[PDB]
Amino acid sequence: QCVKLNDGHFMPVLGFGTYAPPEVPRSKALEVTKLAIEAGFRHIDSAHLYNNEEQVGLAIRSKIADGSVKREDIFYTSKLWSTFHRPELVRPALENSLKKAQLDYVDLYLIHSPMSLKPGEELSPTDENGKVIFDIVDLCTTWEAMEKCKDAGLAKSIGVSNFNRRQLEMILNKPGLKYKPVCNQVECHPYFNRSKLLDFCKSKDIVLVAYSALGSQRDKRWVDPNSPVLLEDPVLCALAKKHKRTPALIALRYQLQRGVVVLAKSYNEQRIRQNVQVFEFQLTAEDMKAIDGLDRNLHYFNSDSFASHPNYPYS
Numbered sequence: 191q192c193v194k195l196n197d198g199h200f201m202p203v204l205g206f207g208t209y210a211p212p213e214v215p216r217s218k219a220l221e222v223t224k225l226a227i228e229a230g231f232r233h234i235d236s237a238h239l240y241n242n243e244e245q246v247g248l249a250i251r252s253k254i255a256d257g258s259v260k261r262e263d264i265f266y267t268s269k270l271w272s273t274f275h276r277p278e279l280v281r282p283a284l285e286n287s288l289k290k291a292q293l294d295y296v297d298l299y300l301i302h303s304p305m306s307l308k309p310g311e312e313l314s315p316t317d318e319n320g321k322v323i324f325d326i327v328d329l330c331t332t333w334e335a336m337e338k339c340k341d342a343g344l345a346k347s348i349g350v351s352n353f354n355r356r357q358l359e360m361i362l363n364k365p366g367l368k369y370k371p372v373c374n375q376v377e378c379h380p381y382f383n384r385s386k387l388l389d390f391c392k393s394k395d396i397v398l399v400a401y402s403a404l405g406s407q408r409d410k411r412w413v414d415p416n417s418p419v420l421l422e423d424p425v426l427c428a429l430a431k432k433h434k435r436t437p438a439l440i441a442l443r444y445q446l447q448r449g450v451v452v453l454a455k456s457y458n459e460q461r462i463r464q465n466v467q468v469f470e471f472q473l474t475a476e477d478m479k480a481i482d483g484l485d486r487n488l489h490y491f492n493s494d495s496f497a498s499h500p501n502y503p504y505s
C-alpha cells in the first residue's frame with residue numbers, strides 16, 4: 191500500500207524504524223530488518239546518525255539474494271546529518287551512505303534536521319554548556335545540493351525532516367527551485383499531532399511522515415521520564431479494548447487515516463509482526479475525534495542540547 195509522491199515515485203505507507211540506542215549490539219539491526227521484511231514491511235528508515243546502514247543494507251540485500259523481494263519492491267531511506275549541510279558536503283555524505291548500505295541508490299534522502307552543526311569529525315560537536323555548536327548555513331543551498339543528487343540518480347526522491355512550516359515555506363519559495371521536498375519527516379503522534387503542519391503539507395502535495403509515532407524510545411539523552419507514556423494513554427487503551435487491538439496499533443492506524451505515512455520501530459519479533467496489523471482494521475470518525483483530543487504539544491525530543499539552536503523548529 192503506497193502513496194504517490196510529487197515527483198511521481200511511490201512510498202509505502204507503513205515504514206520500519208531502524209534506530210536502536212548504542213547499548214544495542216550492531217548486529218541486531220541486521221536480524222530485525224530481515225524480520226521486518228519477512229513480516230511485510232517494504233519501507234525501511236535509516237540514517238547516517240544511526241550507525242546501522244551497513245547492517246540495514248545487508249538485510250535488504252539478503253532478502254533480495256534469497257529471492258524474497260526485488261530491489262524495486264523496497265523503499266530505503268537515509269538522511270544527511272547536520273554536520274554535512276554545507277553544499278559541498280552533501281553529495282559525499284550520500285555517497286558514504288550508499289557505500290555503507292552497498293546500494294546503487296536510495297529511494298529517499300532527507301535533510302535529517304534544519305539545525306546545522308559545525309562541520310567536523312564529531313556527530314554532535316558540543317560547547318561546554320553541552321549545547322550543540324551551531325553552523326550558519328543557508329538551507330536553500332543545501333537543498334540545491336540535494337537536487338543535484340536526485341539529478342545524478344544517487345536518490346530517487348529527496349525531502350526534509352524536522353522542518354516546521356516556515357522552514358518548508360522557505361524551500362518552496364526558493365528562486366529556481368527544481369524539486370519540491372517529497373515529504374517532511376517529523377515527530378507526530380496523538381500527543382503532538384501536528385494538524386496545522388499536516389494541513390500545510392497536504393496543501394503543498396508534501397507527504398508528512400510520522401516518527402516516534404508510538405511515543406519514542408524514551409531515551410534519557412533527550413526525553414524527560416516524567417512525560418506521559420503514549421502507549422499507556424487511557425483513551426488509546428480504551429480504543430485498543432474496543433477494537434481488540436493494542437494501543438500501538440491504535441496509534442499507527444490513526445496516522446494512516448489522516449493521510450500520514452507512519453514509521454514504527456520495534457526490535458521484538460512479535461511486535462514487528464503485530465505492527466503490520468495496522469492494515470487489518472479501521473477507526474471510526476468518533477474514534478479519530480477522541481484521539482484528536484489527546485494533543486498536548488508534547489515533543490519527546492526536548493533537550494537543552496538543541497532548544498537554543500537558531501533553527502530549532504519548535505520555536
Ligand SMILES: NC(=O)c1ccc[n+]([C@@H]2O[C@H](COP(=O)([O-])OP(=O)(O)OC[C@H]3O[C@@H](n4cnc5c(N)ncnc54)[C@H](OP(=O)(O)O)[C@@H]3O)[C@@H](O)[C@H]2O)c1
Nearest residue numbers: 207208209235401402403404405406438454455456457461
Ligand atoms: N527524522 C528524525 O529526526 C527521527 C527521529 C526519531 C526517529 N526517527 C525514525 O523513526 C523511527 C521510529 O521512531 P522511534 O524510534 O522514536 O520509535 P517508535 O516507533 O515511536 O516506537 C517506540 C517504541 O515502541 C515499541 N513498540 C513497537 N511496536 C510496539 C507494539 N506493537 N506494542 C508495544 N510497543 C511497541 C518499541 O519497543 P520494542 O523495540 O521493544 O518493541 C519502540 O522502542 C526511528 O527508528 C527512526 O527510524 C527519525
Ligand SMILES: O=C(NCc1ccc(Cl)cc1)c1n[nH]c([N+](=O)[O-])c1Cl
Nearest residue numbers: 209210239302303304305352491503
Ligand atoms: O537526533 C535525531 N534527530 C534529529 C532531530 C531530532 C529532533 C529535532 Cl526537534 C530536530 C532534529 C534522531 N533522529 N532519529 C533518531 N532515532 O532514534 O531514530 C534520533 Cl535520536
